[PDB]
């Protein structure tokens, strides 16, 4: 039953990796939802749409990198349903950015727990994988989203549609 | 409630489009599952893996094009859960190709039903969209998969691991 | 007696590093043996030979990088005899790949123990050195060797000399 | 009061980061002092001067990278006075190199303590930041300075002004 | 005790030069503080941050040019502590620009006093050094900062976060 | 038992070739030891280190060329342990060069005996192999090492660390 390549790879780590794959695919789908919300004719913030579509594709890449890890270590990928996002309508550029920030922080929390599990199972390969490819990426993503939220709020989002328009143009464009 | 852009776009067409978006995302996820099955150390058919990863990404693009259509016509996208694929283990290159063929034919059946609905609702824009971007793509995809299945079977797949190896190399490589 | 550069570098870490240098040189010599086995006129698998010669040279590089580490930290290199490989005759491409996989897993086990020692001695520099340069390299090497072994077996190695011939051509060539 | 981006970032880590920023700025100022000592008409070792000016600028960059970290994690930078170096007159190329070595080892000790704190607070992001950007840099810097000191001493520094002249020319030039 | 190069270089001029070096290093550190204030996630004015980081680096260059002067004339550099800036929190883009203007005017006042001292000691070399490298630079810097402050105020800074956002984009970006 | 390619290749020649392979691998390991001795922080002669690392790699190439010969003639390679060098500490650049000269002369002596054996067994192919690839190489290597030793001694090595420094720079650099 054991993969010929498997070495120092705990079943709990394999299970946590599968959970993280699902979480990354969920995040990708959330960002997809936000992108096409901004593509609506009654929202019409093209650069918000592009920003979130980019984020969605990046999240898919993260999921695929975790799947690659799973196979590299000799674990077995078990996919689950990708839950629909909590929203169909994201209300505003600012609200979408706030939801993105919350999502990224939740993903980061899951990564930190994954790292803690790896550490407890003395899996330095897994630990350094997470550190190299995920943790810093998360920190950057959270910082960027915080900057966006701060700027939008200072500009007067979401009540100033001029605010969101000009943010779309000058920051995301 | 009606989008300012909406014209000659039936609610039933909007609903069918949402169903098709979900189906395309499902197909993408199925192909993703197959790709990383072939990336397993105990399967190790890299070009099968690449082929299915490519198919997964193409399916995601098809879904995004349908979402774009939905917004273009003034419909509203409603996302649903993306169901996990029926399999974790696809057994063989031949079996995966057969499942892909079955999937593509099911998607094609759904597209033909969508076209029938569009025709009944006298929506020539939607009909042409499906014809131009989806129907011929499906016919080509089905023909290619049928060619793959035929070749694999003639070569002696799935019992001839040499068969699958050489197919991976010479057709998909 | 203490090197002017030495800082947070435990004697046990220095000793384990010397052991790892010897192990890397041993692995290099093993791969050299396999390469020239495949260069024999009665084996004549040129791309197997090239593959293992490449592996031998890579192993020498790994050993030299550990020696560089030892000097960087102010430890002192103590070289030992490089034991001859367990085999003169590696029997087949498949058998050689299986022995390579076993060797790489043993080296990986030694690296993991080295990491554990570093961790226990609170030597984060050493830990991240191992993580960055060795652990992922090992995981990749093991995965590749597992793929090779899987493919060879599925093709019918080692009884199908056609199998090994075609693997030599299409994968390693 | 808590930054919107802050996650898994302990107050003690923030405080230690501020201490490290100050230490890096101090080191930069020390190297600046040494550079312009070697620019004196009665010392006149241009390549020593360039070497230490380079080191000063590198130290400033390290400090700025720590400040960037602090903001990335949502901590708040608190700057302190940058203490003047212990010397105005560094006496010789050899003495300056020895003081630089001592300084670099002290900075390294502070980095190791920072890492230990990060580890204790289970901050893998901070740990890998230190490992990636600082620890190896320190090891290299210490090794280089040790090489310089060794060479100078063997050449006959600081009593052989010919020694320092030729070292300036051939190593640092 | 007298440098072999020293000629027409008064001790009071040497002392005033050392004071100016310290002042330039202080200004550099102030600008550094402002830069990373604007890099905070709750401020998030990237082009303000870049502007002040640039100013900090320029101030470092000014200090180094004065140190070079000191050595050229045969005076001896005596470094002092670099005092921390008066603020950790610069409150707004406008407030930071106003503080920068005040700082630049104080540095200019110190340069004018240095020039007056040079004149009184009949040190035309020192006088023309100050005139060529510093005085016009100061006049330009003050004019630019005044323009920034004027623009920000007219735009409605600091109460209009839109004001600061758009200034960051269009003037400093 | 006899290789299909074997012709005019005496068992004694095959045995002597295996001995020479081991000797070449030993010499490569000796040179490796010397290289990293010169990489020590308390020796710090980078160009000595590079010179000996180059020699080590060349020796490995010589060994591989002999292994290739063995297979070309239809003999069978039998590897032995590679003995550790007689020294961990090579004391000085001059001492290392003297040991290298002694080593090269011993290898040359072994090559001459190999040639004599070939001649006695009327193996002109083997004779001309040795003549073409090894004997002249040895003569050149010995002459170069003698030049190095002569220069070092005349410069005042090993007591003049300035001597070794400047030799490292001007001859080996
Ligand atoms: Mg790490
Ligand atoms: Mg004038
Ligand atoms: Na992610
Ligand atoms: Na499709
Ligand atoms: Na290795
Ligand atoms: Na530093
Ligand atoms: Na200035
Ligand atoms: Na040789």
Swiss-Prot record, chains A, B, C, D, E, F:
Fe cation 2 binds at residues 59, 104, 138. Its EC number is 1.16.3.1. One of its GO terms (cellular component) is ferritin complex. The record marks 19 as: Essential for association with cargo receptor NCOA4. Residues 7-156 form the Ferritin-like diiron domain. It is an enzyme of class 1 (oxidoreductase). GO terms for biological process: immune response; intracellular iron ion homeostasis; iron ion transport; negative regulation of cell population proliferation; negative regulation of ferroptosis; negative regulation of fibroblast proliferation. Keywords: Acetylation, Cytoplasm, Cytoplasmic vesicle, Iron, Iron storage, Lysosome, Metal-binding, Neurodegeneration, Oxidoreductase, Phosphoprotein. Expressed in the liver. CDD domains: Euk_Ferritin (cd01056). It catalyses: 4 Fe(2+) + O2 + 4 H(+) = 4 Fe(3+) + 2 H2O. It is linked to Hemochromatosis 5: A disorder of iron metabolism characterized by iron overload. Excess iron is deposited in a variety of organs leading to their failure, and resulting in serious illnesses including cirrhosis, hepatomas, diabetes, cardiomyopathy, arthritis, and hypogonadotropic hypogonadism. Severe effects of the disease usually do not appear until after decades of progressive iron loading. Neurodegeneration with brain iron accumulation 9: An autosomal dominant neurodegenerative disorder associated with iron accumulation, primarily in the basal ganglia. It is characterized by global developmental delay apparent from infancy, and progressive decline of motor and cognitive skills. Clinical features include delayed walking or inability to walk, spasticity with hyperreflexia, ataxia, dystonia, and poor or absent language. Oligomer of 24 subunits. There are two types of subunits: L (light) chain and H (heavy) chain. The major chain can be light or heavy, depending on the species and tissue type. In the human liver, the heavy chain is predominant. The functional molecule forms a roughly spherical shell with a diameter of 12 nm and contains a central cavity into which the insoluble mineral iron core is deposited. Interacts with NCOA4; NCOA4 promotes targeting of the iron-binding ferritin complex to autolysosomes following starvation or iron depletion. Stores iron in a soluble, non-toxic, readily available form. Important for iron homeostasis. Has ferroxidase activity. Iron is taken up in the ferrous form and deposited as ferric hydroxides after oxidation. Also plays a role in delivery of iron to cells. Mediates iron uptake in capsule cells of the developing kidney. Delivery to lysosomes is mediated by the cargo receptor NCOA4 for autophagic degradation and release of iron. Belongs to the ferritin family. This is Ferritin heavy chain. It comes from Homo sapiens (Human). The gene is FTH1.
């Amino acid at each position: 039953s054991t993969s010929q390549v498997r070495q120092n790879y705990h079943q709990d780590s394999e299970a946590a990796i599968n959970r993280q794959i699902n979480l990354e695919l969920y995040a990708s789908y959330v960002y997809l939802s936000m992108s096409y919300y901004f593509d609506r004719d009654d929202v019409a913030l093209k650069n918000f749409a592009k920003y979130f579509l980019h984020q969605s594709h990046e999240e898919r890449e993260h999921a695929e990198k975790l799947m690659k890890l799973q196979n590299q270590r000799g674990g077995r990928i078990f996919l689950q349903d990708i839950q629909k996002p909590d929203c169909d309508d994201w209300e505003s550029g600012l609200n979408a950015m706030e939801c993105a920030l919350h999502l990224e922080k939740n993903v980061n929390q899951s990564l930190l727990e994954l790292h803690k599990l790896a550490t407890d199972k003395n899996d330095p390969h897994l630990c350094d994988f997470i550190e190299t490819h995920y943790l810093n990426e998360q920190v950057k993503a959270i910082k960027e989203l915080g900057d966006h939220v701060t700027n939008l709020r200072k500009m007067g989002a979401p009540e100033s549609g001029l605010a969101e328009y000009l943010f779309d143009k000058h920051t995301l464009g």
